[PDB]
Each structure stands twice: as C-alpha cells, then as structure tokens.
Design a protein around this ligand. Sequence first.
Ligand SMILES: CCCCCCCC/C=C/CCCCCCCC(=O)O
Ligand SMILES: CCCCCCCC/C=C\CCCCCCCC(=O)O
Lengths: 186, 183
Amino acid sequence: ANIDDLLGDLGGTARAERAKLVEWLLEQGITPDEIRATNPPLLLATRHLVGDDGTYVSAREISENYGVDLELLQRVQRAVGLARVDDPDAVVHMRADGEAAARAQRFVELGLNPDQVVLVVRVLAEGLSHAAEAMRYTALEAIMRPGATELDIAKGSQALVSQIVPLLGPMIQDMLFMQLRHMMET
Amino acid sequence: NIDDLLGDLGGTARAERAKLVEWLLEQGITPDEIRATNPPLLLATRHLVGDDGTYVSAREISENYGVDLELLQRVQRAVGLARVDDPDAVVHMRADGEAAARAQRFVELGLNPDQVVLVVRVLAEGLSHAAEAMRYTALEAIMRPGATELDIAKGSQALVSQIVPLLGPMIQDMLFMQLRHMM
Ligand SMILES: CCCCCCCC/C=C/CCCCCCCC(=O)O
Ligand SMILES: CCCCCCCC/C=C\CCCCCCCC(=O)O
C-alpha cells in the first residue's frame, strides 16, 4: 500500500484503475516521485518516446557539455518558456532540453545577431506550443475508446506514439522548409 | 546575348544585374529560369531549401507516392501556399508535394483526418511567423554597406549554406521540447 499515497483523493472505479495504472508505471521504471509530481500520470510512460529519460542537468553542465555560452543559454531558456528557474547551478533541466537550447550557439557563431536569434526561438516556441496542443488532442482522440481503463490507454499510447514519433521530426522539418521556399519565391 | 534578361533596366541597375546574371549562368542557372524570377537574386540559393525548379500536380503526387488525392488536397489547402485547387494544375513545388504526402501516414495509424488537417493548419501558421522572423534575421547578417546585387547573392548563398544544415535538427528539437512539456 505504498501505492496508496499515489492514488491521492480518488475513489471507487477510478481509484482501482489508477491503482492498475500505477502498478504498471512502476514496472516501467517511473518512480513514486515522478508519479506524484505528474497529474494525471497517464502519459508518464510515453514521455521517454519524446526524449524525456528522467535525467536532469544544470545550465553550467549544459554550457560545458554542449560547448556554449551560459548567458546566451539562459536567454534561450526564457524564450522557450521552460524552467524560469533563473539560478544557473540548479540541476533542473531535462537533458534533451539543454541539448536543444545549446544549438542556439552555432547560429550566433555564424554571425547572426544574438537578439534576433533569441527572437526566432521565441516565435518558433509560440507557434509550436499551439501545434503541440492540437497534436495531443489528436492522439488522445485516437487512443481513447469507450470502456477504456486507464491502463488500456497508457499501453495504447505507447504503441501509437511509438509509431508516430519517427514521422514527426521529418514532418515538422519539411513544413519549415516549405515556408522558407515560399518566402523566397514570395 | 543577355540583353533580354536585362530588359528595361538602365544605369547602375543594369550594370549590377549584368554581373548577377553573369554569375548565375556559371552557377548552372538557365536564362529560362532567370526570366520568370524577379528579381533573380535568390536563384542560386533556393536549391539550398529544396526548390530545384521542378513542379507537379496534386494528381501526379497522388500517383507517384501512392496517397489519397482528396486528403492530399485538404492538406495543401491547410498549408495555404498555392492558389490552384485543381488536381491537374502543375503548380506545386515537388518538395511541397512530398511534404503534403506525409500526412496520410498519420491517418493510416488511426489519427482522425480532420484533426490531422487542422494540425497542419496550426503548424503552418506558427511556422510562417517564425519564417518571417528568420528572413529579417538572415538579411541583417547579409546586407552590408553599399552591397551590389551580386554581393547580396554571394552573401546569401554562403550564409544559407551554413545555416540550413542546423535548421532541420533545430526545429525538430523544438517540437519535441514542446511535446515533453505537455502536462
Ligand atoms: C502534414 C502534418 C500532419 C500533422 C500530423 C499530426 C501529428 C500527430 C501528433 C502527434 C501525437 C503524439 C503526441 C505525443 C505526446 C506525448 C505526451 C507525453 O510526453 O506524455
Ligand atoms: C536561439 C537559437 C535559435 C536559432 C534560430 C535560427 C535562426 C534562423 C535564421 C536564419 C535562417 C533563415 C534562412 C532563410 C532566410 C531567408 C534567406 C533569404 O531568402 O534571403
């Protein structure tokens, strides 16, 4: 009944299904802490498919790991809207997020204006967050089938999201180059 | 002779266009390509973003990539970049047609086609704003004191060549970052 503190204030059917979901999440190496911190837990087991392995890093680690400037790194993280956690020593950044933010540096190395570069991140992040919303709803519609236990959905999202992820990177990339092409001809 | 590529241009403007056309022809660009494109400036740069000059119809895309024509045309509308909604009109850049053809695979995995088409629409709109912020960013880096057409063309080709390899990986990383923070 360690699990009991993870079901929270839930009752009846919803508590028994959540208990099945929690048992399974624990076998997938999700810790009680990740489950308590994530409400609802349903898609904790799909997260590793989009690059969250549960490992964290500080801004200092990021800046030495990926060879980038800490000030610039901080500005980018703000633009993306992630971890306002201003302190550059707190180990509170998803590892994939630090890699992604460090790419900023190379555009500045080529002589692009640091301010314009942070701007582009800001604008891209705004657009993509809306697109991520609709994506989630889209995939939710697909997995959620009447008489679906919470565990049925979690397992079904693993199978579905697993198949979709390899297509998404190429898709968004094509969609960016489509805009660039038509901004050049335009 | 170039003269008809130069047209009504006179003065400094003709003299500069002559040097740009000169360099474009040795870059392997045809007089044909230069006429249709005004100004001809980004012609030796647009290949870097996947515009090779090839054009296709929605029907050819449909047949060549084995995707549903009707779904394909909804996706093209959702991107919102070419005005002809005629299956046989040859007005889609080849790379745009392939990109539109990817959408059906999401549908064969159980995603609802109305939701997919809407996602395309929302993505297209987010990316067009970024793309304009990118254009201004690129120009600032390229445009220098009293630059000629040709300096601009050379500067843009060098700069885009260096940036493009980075851009794909970057936008893809940004999408996944948003997907990690979905709650
Ligand atoms: C031409 C573009 C077509 C658009 C296709 C639509 C894309 C489908 C969206 C992706 C669904 C996967 C979302 C996964 C979210 C995982 C959330 C989590 O980390 O727990
Ligand atoms: C903080 C890191 C963000 C990095 C964002 C990358 C900045 C991209 C800016 C330049 C890429 C744009 C290339 C195409 C622009 C138009 C060029 C042209 O047609 O003249």
